[PDB]
Amino acid sequence: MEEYYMKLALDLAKQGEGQTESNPLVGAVVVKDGQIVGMGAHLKYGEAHAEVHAIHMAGAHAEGADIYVTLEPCSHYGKTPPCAELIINSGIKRVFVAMRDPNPLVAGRGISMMKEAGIEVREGILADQAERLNEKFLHFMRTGLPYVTLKAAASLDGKIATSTGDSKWITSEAARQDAQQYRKTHQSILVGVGTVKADNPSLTCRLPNVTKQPVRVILDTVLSIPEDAKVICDQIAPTWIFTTARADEEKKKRLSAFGVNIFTLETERIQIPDVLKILAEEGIMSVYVEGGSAVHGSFVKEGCFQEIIFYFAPKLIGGTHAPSLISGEGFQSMKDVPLLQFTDITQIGRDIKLTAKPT
Amino acid sequence: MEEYYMKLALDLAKQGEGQTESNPLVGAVVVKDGQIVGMGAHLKYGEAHAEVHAIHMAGAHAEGADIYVTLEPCSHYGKTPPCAELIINSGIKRVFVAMRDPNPLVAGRGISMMKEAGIEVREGILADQAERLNEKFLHFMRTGLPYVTLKAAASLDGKIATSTGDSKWITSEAARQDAQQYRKTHQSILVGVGTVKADNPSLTCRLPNVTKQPVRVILDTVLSIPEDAKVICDQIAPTWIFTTARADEEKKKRLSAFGVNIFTLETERIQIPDVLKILAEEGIMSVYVEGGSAVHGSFVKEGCFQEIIFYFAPKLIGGTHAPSLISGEGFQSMKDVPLLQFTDITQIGRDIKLTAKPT
Amino acid sequence: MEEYYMKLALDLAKQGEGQTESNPLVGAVVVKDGQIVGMGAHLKYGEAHAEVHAIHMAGAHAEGADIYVTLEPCSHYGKTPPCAELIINSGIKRVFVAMRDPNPLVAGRGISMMKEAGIEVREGILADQAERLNEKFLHFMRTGLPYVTLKAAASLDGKIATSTGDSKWITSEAARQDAQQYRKTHQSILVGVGTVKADNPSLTCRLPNVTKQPVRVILDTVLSIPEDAKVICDQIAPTWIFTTARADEEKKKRLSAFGVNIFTLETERIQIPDVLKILAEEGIMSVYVEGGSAVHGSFVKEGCFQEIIFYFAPKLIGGTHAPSLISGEGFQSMKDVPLLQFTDITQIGRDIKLTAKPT
Amino acid sequence: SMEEYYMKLALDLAKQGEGQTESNPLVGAVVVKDGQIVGMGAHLKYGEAHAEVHAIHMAGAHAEGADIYVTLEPCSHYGKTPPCAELIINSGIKRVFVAMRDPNPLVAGRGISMMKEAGIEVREGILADQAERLNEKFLHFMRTGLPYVTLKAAASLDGKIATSTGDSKWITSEAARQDAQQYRKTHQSILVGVGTVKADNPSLTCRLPNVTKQPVRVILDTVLSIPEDAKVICDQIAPTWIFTTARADEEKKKRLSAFGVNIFTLETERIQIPDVLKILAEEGIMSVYVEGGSAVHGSFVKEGCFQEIIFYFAPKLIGGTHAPSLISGEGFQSMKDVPLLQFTDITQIGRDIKLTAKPT
Ligand SMILES: [Zn+2]
Ligand SMILES: [Zn+2]
Ligand SMILES: [Zn+2]
């Protein structure tokens, strides 16, 4: 029954998905005498928290009630009093919290704050789900780096194109539509300039109700990207580029005029660790990296990914010179190759989608 | 009811799986006045036929009864009256054959012999399930070529080793064992010399009572196979090598005196269709190809395979110069890449096993 | 998409489940620029409607937004502005109504108030689920008659006690426990006096979640009820008795003193249809009929029931003279017995619970 | 797991005899040598070879040093040919896997001892539950000297068999009627009171596609009220036994027996069910499908003579005091004396729900 309410809490949180920007999804339910008197979710960025909505709806009923929150109630004093304080003042006598704040400086602070007012606090109810709920945000807050998903499509023998660079019909429309879901769950989409030169993709989210568009991140060492590429001309989504000092100043000017934001790194080669750090500083908590065997090569090599999703088509492309899924340096001994764990196997249309994660 | 009995015949037939050597599995059910009176199956190589068991069991009831057979009764008047005849001298009024004999030469001789004696023969019953029953054997008879299965193990990104050649266990123990099952359902095992010198394998069917070791076939362009390797020596299983005219006469003679059957090809490179033709001449109905990125490439480019089985580990190897699954020429244009069809997906331990087939 | 939003409103609606008692369950979700900005449900009797909670949570985002509502917004003027008014006063652009207010008069009057304000009203979105959400309330408003549920317990052979009146162990504590639930989802509990004179029940919901005891209705033609019965003295809940002119005058007086409500029908025998009409006029929207095989017999003969619930135990009583499930007259010819339809057949403990509905 | 696999096969082979073995139990057997199946057999015909004989013959010399799986204990008695336990010993079989022992407590384990005496390893219990399921009725009769009894009836949701005027026209569906006909095939007899014979004058014959040797028709009488008019009498379609008593007209007793109709006479004015079943259990009958008469069903119930209850409920309410109920007659006066049963199955058929229950 404690789970029944916490589950309601989790379902409520889900209604805010993609309306909170970088803020976590949170659900709150106020139960008084066995009756649901208030429900809340965090629906808009920089706007009221779930507890604020749930408490207000509860009105006088908050007095003596219990409240279930999927994430520890904030405890810092900003423009308005913190939710833990809001709870204290409303008269709630018991609080059920799924999980603690991910920040080490904050964790337990709200909890203790409320206990210190008489309120009884039980923790852990449906933690796993509370976890999956804000998985990207959670990882971002705990490490300070965006959650990275690498994705690629290949033939059954591991090729992403023939020896002539032909990749027409390697993935079915069904697989492409299924992959399109990640363009909605990540804040940015990333590829190397090679993908732009070969495929000239828009890299946009074209799903049903596609409101916001993710930031398009291109890795372009020498700034050799075609000035007429969709990513530079369609204005559909923000476009950011990472180059080095070898980039041409006049070209940067022309592109900035197109609204492209350019980040010039101080190294001679682009370091994925550098770009991930700069994206986090910009508030990008997630990256859908979908292209360039070499780009995928660096992320793997550096160990900078949390999820790897490969789509395999029932086809065999020959190839000594056909390009494989992951290129670059790679690991030399089977003893140094990290072990992943298949997290999922799904058939989409005639293709098979395999998803795996580290450790 | 019609299909019911034939289904029983089929279930009986399967009980002979792996015990009949090169002979086909067959089931027979005698039904009299609406009651099952006889049942039979081919259980052992060179022994009684399904019809022979069923007729005996049914004894006196055999007269005026129906008989359901999964495969057209034998016709040759060899050193014992054939089953078609045995069905006849027994008083059986009606025969239900599921399919005709695969040998385009005899196909129908049985049906006719019987019909040309008063017997009512009706074919087609569950012919579909009967095709499944003897898949490999039927392909052999229908095409005159051995049924081929390609098998390989690889990382999730399609490498069969690191850029160092380190094959040091990509796939898990559990996956190798599942793979062993095939050395048991194929009359031969094939690999290029490359595999011989790198693993000096036994290529033996090291599972329970095999009661027969498969032929070990090796593709050796120049006959550079080491004369100390297990396949040459160890006298455990027959070992056939295919080579070209670059082979040394004395090496060819030497190894021949050790029981090694050497076949010489008058072409510059070994041509897969030729190797498959010669093997069918020698009576080999199926071959399990498991070694060589290049050998697998030849079978794929030539379209010479009936089944492909890939085991993917939860690992990423990387490196542009790491050997991929299928090497060699391969297809240059995606419009020429044949569409296959996933047939099965089974997780084996921490590894995934994908199996697929043509058209 | 409207589907999704209307579904959300339904799930939010359920959350009020048995907490609004008389009031129906309504869910409200306000959408602005493809984003959910408001969610509401009717949570307590006499309190804020669903639309109110939703609109308040939406705040300024309500302007030019859409809103989904499981039930036509009220137009009730007086103690507060009707929700139909709050909707336009908030600047809502379009409203989606799942179904209209079943109250004959009020039907369409809410849609109109809004339509004449410029609001584009669209209806019928998921009218199916929204129909089952308030099954009893709907029926009561559409027909003017309380929703009726008949409930009984019996042995597998259909007897309700032995031929000596013993019914000590018919159904299990679990069935009797599952039965209790219905004592809370109905505004009233109805029984003949036979039940009171036989068992002298309290007819109260014992379940630890009550805060509003249902009306205890006793059909007592000649007013023979034991004056000292719990139903008259315990005064834990309202007790309404239906009699006729054959009731002793002084006795009715002594009973009313205890605060019991006595209705004197004008017919010489109690007519179910009349009792139901009167119960409706008094506000009672639903009645749970537990006792009297004869009372059940009358409800069934008149066709005055929306649902039938029988608990069957794995026992056989037998007995020509043992009492059956349905007493009274009964139908003379099979051609005249109405056909019901099984709606649910779930096992409760060692017993089987069968539920059926008319036509 | 491999062992269970072979016993599974043995059980599936046994089912192929489901058709005609008459009173003989259904048995299966498979012989395996060095990991290969070499012999399969089942009891296919009443009076003919046992599953073991078939399997052992089929195995030939492979029997030597082999294993054999049998769903039932190999017979050990001496008749016209040697018993299977003997055949197994003589063929050189090394070990036997027996699902369950023989039913007849007078024969139970005798075969096991014989083989064990010859040094054959006997492992028991593999898939015993299923073997139990396989010959459940036979298994009951052998173990109780009594016929397996199934009671079946159809009624309204409120447990009525007809309205207060006797009309029972559209009581249960055609599907349920159809599903009810199946049982006339798994039972050797169909029991019904004279009340029924005169009521609808039924054939009580099995129509399901494929039926050999029709089931014995048993009528529970008293005053030999059965109208010579038709059906079970001058409808020579199968046996029609009749249990009667004293007040049985002397003239007609033979006037009927003149066809092929049997006529048992009991020394009581009350046809006592337990007596009837014992007679049947004597005449080789092993199962009875009682379907007619609420009083008839009541008799069996009070007496506690049933292993299965199958009631069909139609979504209808007939109501009415005086409307006939499912089970009539004596019955139990105290609830403490009502046997607790157990529901074993809830199947929906057409618009009707079919409930089956079994004792404790
Ligand atoms: Zn907060
Ligand atoms: Zn043959
Ligand atoms: Zn309202």
Ligand SMILES: [Zn+2]
């Ligand atoms: Zn025997």
